[PDB]
Each structure stands twice: as structure tokens, then as C-alpha cells.
């Protein structure tokens, strides 16, 4: 017997519902999602880390002339300076007052700390929501990771459980993502080679350990002081440091619909959005017959208290006269009120207590027990308190 | 020098590696309530 439903995507809210065939008894089903994931598929484009200016040593020629020689290094700039007169400690480097020559070479390479201080650029797409569920079906509790693809079932005890598709395609993740310091930022990073000097992309390596890096820093060589040996370089600072200072705080603290962002197997958990549909094939042996479960007689619901708070601030009571003493399930079909107890013990001529939550000020809800229903009414009161720590169970 | 200067490779020590560092924790804030409102009295030690 197939059964379907629509459970909200929300952790802690223990969903409960009952399968109701005719000749067989109600079967309760209690489903608590503990952790609802959202794992994008990710493609790495490049890593960018701090830079180090590599100043090759000055080639000094005295009474001569040198010509540049390209070693094809990242952002190799190469200039020749005339009218130099250096000083080492020993004294002047040569007598030739003019007609001296100083070849300056400067390039740009990736910092030594880039194995461990690197920002990973990502293109995200095609998230696969993945839910951890705690599922109790006739005292046969199970705990299961399930996928909310169309046909990705999980089969325990002969019970076949299919989930999805989700009623929303939302991701807090966009087409362009950066990962750094265990923290995911939503940044419109450029493509390989479209960097600019001063921001994310001034250095671009494919991997953390690659060979070819694209550099652009506005590396300009300057003239050295009279009586000095140095390659004076002016260039743009690390765009990585500026992405760090001006940070645009992470999606861990700026994602909507209440998402908790996490690291390497990138995921956004407990995103309170959407309703997931389920589909349960239940093998017939889990169904007892109504002739062997207590058929009631002459039920009538009262209402001891009703506070329409967020919690189960409602207590209703049912008088009854059954045929045996045992167990049955209870469910309020409408959204007028939601129950806490998915099953109630029943003596022969007892009076049973049921707990619920509501938002209506004048309730009138139909409540099921073993077979037959009851019309439970009353009047509610407001809560004395107006801030809580848990969400709405209704 | 002139010809070919590159003779060998050194290894840089003291590289930036991971671990754990003891960071402070702020004083417990004072939380007053109200209808659709949360009032917070905050008393820090260092900037937070």
C-alpha cells in the first residue's frame, strides 16, 4: 500500500503521520530529519595567494653596455640603467664614471606559504540535497542518509522510502565562490587571465602546485640611488590582502533561509526552506488487522488547556470505552493543530491525554484514534512569554 | 656573474601551518525581551 506526504525541510520538527488502510489498523510513521544537506557540484578554476617579488641580482658592467635577455618568467620586467656608480663595502665598483650599466630584472612568483594560505575559486552548480532521517515505522526505528533525487530509494526492513524532488531550487551558493580559512564567500572572481592589479586574481595558478601562473601587478622598475646596488620596484599590493581586509562577510553569517555553511565537501545545512515529498512502500506484514487492535466505542474529546504558543502548549483529553487494552495512533489531519504523541496507550474504560500545538484561538479539529474520529473543540489563551528558542511545531 | 649562476636550491623553514590558537570569549550579554523585539546590553572588554 503506497503512501505519500509532504514533510517540511526543517530539523528538530518531528513529523508524524499515519497510514490508514481499511481492514488493517493505523500504522504510525515518525520522521525526524536531523541534518539536511545541500552539496553543490564544484569546479576549481584557480588558486590565488600572496606574491613575492623576485629580484634577480643586478648585472653590472663597467665601461660597457648590456642588452636584456628574456627569461620568460611571470611578469618579467627588464630595464637597463646608465650612469651608475655603485658602492660595495670595499669602495666604488669601477672607475668608469659614466658608461656604466646596470641590468635590472624583476618578476613575480607565488609565496612560500601558498600550500596553506590559498584561496580556492569555484564554480558551483547542480546541488544534490541530502538528508539524514530518523524514521520509526511500527517500532522498527532506522537512521538513514537519503537523496532527494526522483528515484534514489532506501530499503530497510522491506520498507522502501523514496524522497523528493524538493519544492525549491534555491542555493545560497552562486555561480562564483571563493574558499578561504574554512569559510565560503560569494565573490565575482574573474576568469583565468582576466585578473587585474589590486584584487583577487592578480596571481592565478590552476592548482596549489602548478607551473604556469598568470601575474599582473603593475610592476614598474625605477632607477637606483647614486651609490647603491638594488632593483627598486613599485607595484600594486596583494589583491589577496585587500580581499581579506575588505572581506564581504561569509555566507555562514549572511545566507538567507537559515543556512549553516561548512567546509571542503561544501554544504549548506539546515536550510529551512521547501517541503520534501516522500513515498513509502510498506510490506503487508507490518499491518495488523483491526479485529486484533482495539476498536473504540463512544469517544468524546474535551480540552483541558490551550495556549497557542510555539511549543505544545495544548492539552486535550479523550474519554472512551474500547474493546481491548493496547496501542493506537492519533493524528490531526488539518493544520489546525499538530500532535506530539504519535501513539497513545489505551486501557478499556480510561481517559487518555494528548498533547498538541496550535495557532488558532477557537479550535475545532478532527482527531483520530484506533479507527474512529472525534471533534475536539475549545477556547485558547495567549502565551505569557513572547520570545522562545525553538521554532514553530505547527 | 656572467655565465650561469643557478647552482642549487635551499628550503625555506618556518612555513605557515595550521593548528589551534586560544582566542578570547566575550562577556555574556544581557538579553531583555519585548514584542517582536530583542534588546541587548553589551559590555565588552576588547573590541568585538
Amino acid at each position: 500500500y503506497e503512501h505519500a506526504t509532504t514533510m517540511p525541510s526543517q530539523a528538530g520538527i518531528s513529523y508524524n503521520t499515519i497510514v490508514n488502510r481499511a481492514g488493517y489498523a493505523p500504522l504510525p510513521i515518525s520522521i525526524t530529519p536531523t541534518k539536511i544537506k545541500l552539496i553543490p557540484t564544484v569546479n576549481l578554476e584557480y588558486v590565488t595567494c600572496h606574491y613575492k617579488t623576485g629580484m634577480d641580482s643586478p648585472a653590472i658592467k663597467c665601461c660597457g653596455s648590456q642588452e636584456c635577455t628574456p627569461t620568460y618568467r611571470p611578469d618579467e620586467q627588464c630595464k637597463v640603467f646608465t650612469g651608475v656608480y655603485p658602492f660595495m663595502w670595499g669602495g666604488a665598483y669601477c672607475f668608469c664614471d659614466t658608461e656604466n650599466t646596470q641590468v635590472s630584472k624583476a618578476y613575480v612568483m607565488k609565496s612560500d606559504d601558498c600550500l596553506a594560505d590559498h584561496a580556492e575559486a569555484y564554480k558551483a552548480h547542480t546541488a544534490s540535497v541530502q538528508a539524514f532521517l530518523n524514521i520509526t515505522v511500527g517500532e522498527h526505528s532506522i537512521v538513514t542518509t537519503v537523496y532527494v533525487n526522483g528515484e534514489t530509494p532506501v530499503n530497510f526492513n522491506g520498507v522502501k522510502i523514496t524522497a523528493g524532488p524538493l519544492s525549491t531550487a534555491w542555493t545560497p551558493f552562486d555561480r562564483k565562490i571563493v574558499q578561504y580559512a574554512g569559510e565560503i564567500y560569494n565573490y565575482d572572481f574573474p576568469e583565468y587571465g582576466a585578473g587585474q592589479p589590486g584584487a583577487f586574481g592578480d596571481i592565478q595558478s590552476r592548482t596549489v602546485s602548478s607551473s604556469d601562473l598568470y601575474a599582473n601587478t603593475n610592476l614598474v622598475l625605477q632607477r637606483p640611488k647614486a651609490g647603491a646596488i638594488h632593483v627598486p620596484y613599485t607595484q600594486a599590493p596583494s589583491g589577496f590582502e585587500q580581499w581579506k581586509k575588505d572581506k564581504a562577510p561569509s555566507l555562514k553569517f549572511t545566507a538567507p533561509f537559515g543556512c549553516e555553511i561548512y567546509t571542503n565537501p561544501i554544504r549548506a545545512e539546515n536550510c529551512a526552506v521547501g517541503s520534501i515529498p516522500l513515498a513509502f512502500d510498506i510490506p503487508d506484514a507490518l499491518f495488523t488487522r483491526v479485529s486484533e487492535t482495539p476498536t473504540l466505542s463512544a469517544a468524546e474529546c474535551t480540552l483541558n488547556e490551550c495556549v497557542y504558543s510555539s511549543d505544545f502548549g495544548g492539552i486535550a483529553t479523550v474519554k472512551y470505552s474500547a474493546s481491548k487494552s493496547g496501542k493506537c495512533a492519533v493524528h490531526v489531519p488539518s493544520g489546525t493543530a499538530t500532535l506530539k504523541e504519535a501513539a497513545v496507550e489505551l486501557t478499556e474504560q480510561g481517559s487518555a491525554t494528548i498533547h498538541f500545538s496550535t495557532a488558532n484561538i477557537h479550535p475545532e479539529f478532527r482527531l483520530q484514534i484506533c479507527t474512529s474520529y472525534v471533534t475536539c473543540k475549545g477556547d485558547c489563551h495567549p502565551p505569557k512569554d513572547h520570545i522562545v528558542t525553538h521554532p514553530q511545531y505547527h | 656573474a656572467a655565465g650561469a649562476t643557478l647552482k642549487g636550491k635551499l628550503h625555506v623553514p618556518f612555513l605557515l601551518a595550521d593548528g589551534k590558537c586560544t582566542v578570547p570569549l566575550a562577556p555574556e550579554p544581557m538579553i531583555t525581551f519585548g514584542f517582536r523585539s530583542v534588546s541587548l546590553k553589551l559590555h565588552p572588554k576588547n573590541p568585538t
Binding site: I361, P382, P383, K384, D385, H386 | F35, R36
Partner: peptide, 18 residues
């Protein structure tokens, strides 16, 4: 805990714009 009893100053705090 809107300031009023429906049983007015209620229904203007809770569910405003009315």
C-alpha cells in the same frame, strides 16, 4: 503577546496593516 485581548489594540500589532 500582543497588547490586547480579542475576547481593541489587538490585531493591529499581531497581523498589522489592517
Amino acid at each position: 503577546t500582543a497588547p490586547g485581548n480579542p475576547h481593541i489594540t489587538h490585531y493591529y500589532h499581531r497581523y498589522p496593516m489592517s
